[PDB]
Amino acid sequence: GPHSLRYFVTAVSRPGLGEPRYMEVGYVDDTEFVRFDSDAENPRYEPRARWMEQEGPEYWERETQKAKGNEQSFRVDLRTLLGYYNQSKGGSHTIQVISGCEVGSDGRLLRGYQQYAYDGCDYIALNEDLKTWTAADMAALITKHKWEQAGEAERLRAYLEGTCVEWLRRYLKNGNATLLRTDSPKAHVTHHSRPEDKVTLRCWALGFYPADITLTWQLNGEELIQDMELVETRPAGDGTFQKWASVVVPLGKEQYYTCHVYHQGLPEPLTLRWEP
């Protein structure tokens, strides 16, 4: 399979209540491995995964500084967008960054990216050629012009082509036993009453990794994606995920609906109908 390093960084002003909240979370494949939070007691990059303890003192101080630097940068960023959008100093605003790179199993760059948004909406994002920028609106068009002038894009391609892929590689190895594992899902179905002589069949899938999975309800050779109802796959609080999908069938004929679970740890999909 392919893998990826993923940063989720947030800045958010709180006028009247001091400097902004700046946080940074880092993910190698659905596995949280790093965190920074300017609201901590002693704000410092901290491990979120045993395999990141391995890293020595130097790493943690470098990340913690370039983090503190980014924090400062978004303080500036936040005032700047105030002017751009002609917004008044008195409100609370958010900047968001998604940054990282995915690679293939040969370990080569597959794709890189860095995306910014302000107050929820897209602002500006590096295109896939790792050269151009796509601006969301004319405000983020100024930022664009700034960054073409400052060779920020070719500077980012050095980080993406280089730093990012080479540490993803690092991480995948440091933590091969964790990141490269495969927990198969265990599944069941629950039954629930409903007015009008109808019945709800929920198919649960639990304790699995990676997060990617598919559940379908079938009936005599055709899926019912439309008359289904699922929940986004979710973290279960221990580095595993779970998902459930339900379907409304008529009482007496629930025996004929079957559930299907597709996943990396499932050589063959799972098929289950009900526990009368």
Partner: peptide
Amino acid sequence: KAVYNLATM
């Protein structure tokens, strides 16, 4: 060397 040195807008 892990996370990015973020630019100002």
